[PDB]
């Protein structure tokens, strides 16, 4: 997260860290046994870490649960990043409390201009490299589909939306992938891709979650 702020310990109780020896992506807890992340974050041997603030210090509220199964979307396009969504099932159900809580799936898509909360442990610098240890937060509006395609001509699909500021300065960055974009208490976006971080005319692109509620519900009900 570039140009954001420190969330505060466990103020984003649905934010999870995906660990394979190190934090490589974020994720969103949707129930006690399932996490939503980005399909491009897929790798074997994922450990889901819930209740995290400082990812480098055990602070007493963490839950480390190994993944039993990862399910990349059946139409995930690694060339264009279309359908960049992945489901992760936990080997054991997490203990839902105040610091570990699920986030609701959307019943309707969000409109342009809606303020959303983007969080993650990604790089905090637009030019350089500095990785935080506590969770960083960012309030960013959803940009119109027209301006999103205007920023990335020929690369935006109906399953992606842009969020942030065309003047740059505030954006998600390397390490934030798979993380949540929550608008009005609903998980509307997944940190997907971009061109650099916090660059002018290069806002972050996010997986449009509201187009996958049907596939998410049926998949977890059968797995």
């Amino acid at each position: 997260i570039v140009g954001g702020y420190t969330c505060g310990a466990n103020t984003v109780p649905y934010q999870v860290s995906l660990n394979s020896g190190y934090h490589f992506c974020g994720g969103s807890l949707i129930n006690s046994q399932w996490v939503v992340s980005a399909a491009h974050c897929y790798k074997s041997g994922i450990q889901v870490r819930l209740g995290e603030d400082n990812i480098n210090v055990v602070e007493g509220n963490e839950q480390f649960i190994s993944a039993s199964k990862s399910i990349v979307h059946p139409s995930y396009n690694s060339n264009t990043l279309n359908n960049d969504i992945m489901l992760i099932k936990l080997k054991s159900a997490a203990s839902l409390n105040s610091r570990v809580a699920s986030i609701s799936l959307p019943t309707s898509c969000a409109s342009a201009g809606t303020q959303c909360l983007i969080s993650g442990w990604g790089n905090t610098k637009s030019s350089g490299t500095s990785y935080p240890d506590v969770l960083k937060c960012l309030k960013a509006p959803i940009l119109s589909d027209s301006s999103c395609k205007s920023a990335y001509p020929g690369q935006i699909t109906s399953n992606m939306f842009c969020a942030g500021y065309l003047e740059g300065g505030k954006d998600s960055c390397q390490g934030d992938s798979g993380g949540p974009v929550v608008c009005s208490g609903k998980l509307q976006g997944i940190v997907s891709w971009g061109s650099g971080c916090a660059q002018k005319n290069k806002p972050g692109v996010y997986t449009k979650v509201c187009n996958y509620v049907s596939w998410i519900k049926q998949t977890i009900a059968s797995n």
Partner: protein, 56 residues
């Protein structure tokens, strides 16, 4: 600046694009670089040239 999967239009000149996915792919030999925000990042170059680079 190699390239292993090169797609070209059949025109004169051809319009070619490299569809390689690399963990850096953001050379100065790429004008438009697109990366995921993961660790490592998966980057693609959507530049359009009239040629294809040698393989890797």
């Amino acid at each position: 600046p190699c390239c292993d999967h090169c797609s070209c239009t059949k025109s004169i000149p051809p319009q070619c694009r490299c569809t390689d996915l690399r963990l850096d792919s953001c050379h100065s030999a790429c004008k438009s670089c697109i990366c995921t925000l993961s660790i490592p990042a998966q980057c693609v170059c959507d530049d359009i040239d009239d040629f294809c680079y040698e393989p890797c």
